[PDB]
Amino acid sequence: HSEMTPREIVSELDKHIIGQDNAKRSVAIALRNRWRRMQLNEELRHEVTPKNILMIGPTGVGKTEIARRLAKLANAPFIKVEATKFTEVGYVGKEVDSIIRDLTDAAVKMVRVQAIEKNRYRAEELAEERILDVLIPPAKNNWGQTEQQQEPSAARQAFRKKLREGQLDDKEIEKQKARKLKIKDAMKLLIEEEAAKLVNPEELKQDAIDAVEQHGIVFIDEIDKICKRGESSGPDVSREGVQRDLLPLVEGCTVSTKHGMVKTDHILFIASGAFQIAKPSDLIPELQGRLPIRVELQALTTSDFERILTEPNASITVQYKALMATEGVNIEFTDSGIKRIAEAAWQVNESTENIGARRLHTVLERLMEEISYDASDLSGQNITIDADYVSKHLDALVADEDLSRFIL
Amino acid sequence: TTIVSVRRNGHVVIAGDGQATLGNTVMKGNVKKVRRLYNDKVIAGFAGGTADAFTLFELFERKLEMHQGHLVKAAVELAKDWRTDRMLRKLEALLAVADETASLIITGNGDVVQPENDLIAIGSGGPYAQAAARALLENTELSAREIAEKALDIAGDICIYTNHFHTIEELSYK
Ligand SMILES: Nc1ncnc2c1ncn2[C@@H]1O[C@H](COP(=O)(O)OP(=O)(O)O)[C@@H](O)[C@H]1O
């Protein structure tokens, strides 16, 4: 769909993810290829298949984020499944087909909501005419001067201009309606009333299929958790089983959805792993084949942490500022405050368990616990979160390890 | 009754008397037999029930709304239903209708008629008016309004069913 070049894709992705340039390009080549394919002939269009990617890296460094923004940037159906979710189906559990089903139910819960956007002006234009007709019951057979039913637009234009907030005036209109009512309702009862007329079925539901088939993006987290490890054998066949079960999906097959018949042959798959225990070559042969692209993501650094704190669009720091503004409170972060927020996050991760950029959300959130509660009783003030503030609030927590395993 | 319509020098009229008769006596003496239609653009006169009118003159109006002022056509569509629609069929009358374009008669038979010179004379006194109208129109410079008037008076003088109460409706255009 999008005609963006890889370089433009990476650019657009830089607005949400710090670093991880290689993964960016990998995922960007993927999107541009979908375009590249549609520019081909009949034969070559069946042949060319998605270049599925295998992202390799430690927790919370941007694997999913990258894949999620990619999806979002191509208005494509997106689903994120955890691979081990099926390691248990040998005893019972979700069949792997559910993936394509869900990627469909959301590829629907998507086309539906985005049909309320396109049809949100129809009910408040060529449909608000409902109340105006019971306000000034049109002439006994309008005459016809292509400006005659626009003539009123005096008596008429008055009811429309006055209908800029003034309602609660009960009337009635028309299974159409008939029933007598108000306007905080005759009007809203009209909102949906006239709307379900434009949106049909065999196109809305038919297109979801179209989306999934053409632009679907499946993110399979922890793919490495279903590779073979040298501790046992019984669980290995179960693991390898999920690999075989997933095989039909990435090699090309047909799944049954209560919305139609989806074809996976062009769904883009982004698998994900850490690979500390297993190595990508532990994956079964058929899967490695279907996972042509390999890309690593680096661990994040304190500098990346500082950058993640403020650069991204709607970064947690920015969101926070916004939220406190709701309280009439002007919050401000100094470069050193942020430097210390990142610092703390890094400390805890190094001293306890490393959970990537995730740690920033909990640190930042604890740091603010106090302002967040008193926000309403501080309206009209300029609170500055500087290095001092940061230290007075997080030092004792970070310093105490056992405490951090609970509170941070 | 006598309905007289004339047209001369970018001026069209329709005139009528106001006598309604029951047997050999006068029921009413001031019946308005010439109204106006289509946002006072189209004039009309008629012979029949006060209601038949009000139903045939309302319908006509809408037909004009369905044919952008184009008289004739609306008239064509009117005379149409008027001889087709089960109900509308019982209505009896003679609509005289004239706009800046043309002027014509309509009969329950569905006929749409454009007389020789937009000269119309329907009703029992019809021909006496036609005669006087034709005379004046061919031997004097009098105005369309003056014509219909005098023609009408002549009529009411000859016609036992026509009186001297008038109702004139003009129209200028050039
Ligand atoms: N490189 C990065 N740039 C911006 N945000 C990041 C980055 N890495 C992690 N994060 C933040 O941390 C969370 C971790 O999830 P995610 O980024 O999907 O990585 P992972 O798939 O390894 O868990 C996300 O909510 C994201 O906002």
Please provide a written account of the structure.
This is part of a larger assembly, with chains A (408 residues) and B (174 residues). Helices cover 45% and strands 11% of the residues of chain A. With 408 residues, chain A is α/β, with parallel strands linked by helices. Chain A folds into three domains: 2-109 and 209-297, Rossmann fold (3-Layer(aba) Sandwich); 110-208, Helicase, Ruva Protein, domain 3 (Orthogonal Bundle); 300-407, Helicase, Ruva Protein, domain 3 (Orthogonal Bundle). In chain A, the strands form four sheets. In chain A, strands 2-5-8-1-9 form a five-stranded parallel β-sheet, sandwiched between helices. In chain A, helix 15 packs parallel to helix 17 (387-399). Chain A is globular and about 85 Å long. In chain B, helix 1 (50-65) packs across helix 2 (71-84) and helix 3 (126-139) runs antiparallel to helix 4. Helices cover 34% and strands 25% of the residues of chain B. The longest helix of chain B has 16 residues, at 50-65. In chain B, the strands form three sheets. Chain B has a five-stranded antiparallel β-sheet. In chain B, strands 2-1-10 form a three-stranded antiparallel β-sheet, with helices on one face. Chain B has a single domain (1-174), classed as Aminohydrolase, N-terminal nucleophile (Ntn) domain (Glutamine Phosphoribosylpyrophosphate, subunit 1, domain 1, 4-Layer Sandwich), CATH 3.60.20. Chain B has 174 residues and is of the alpha+beta class. Classes of the chains: A alpha/beta (408), B alpha+beta (174). Chains A and B meet through loops of A and helix 1 of B. Adenosine-5'-diphosphate is lined by residues 17-20, 59-65, 308, 312, 356-358 of chain A. Residues 17-20, 59-65, 308, 312, 356-358 of chain A line the site of adenosine-5'-diphosphate.
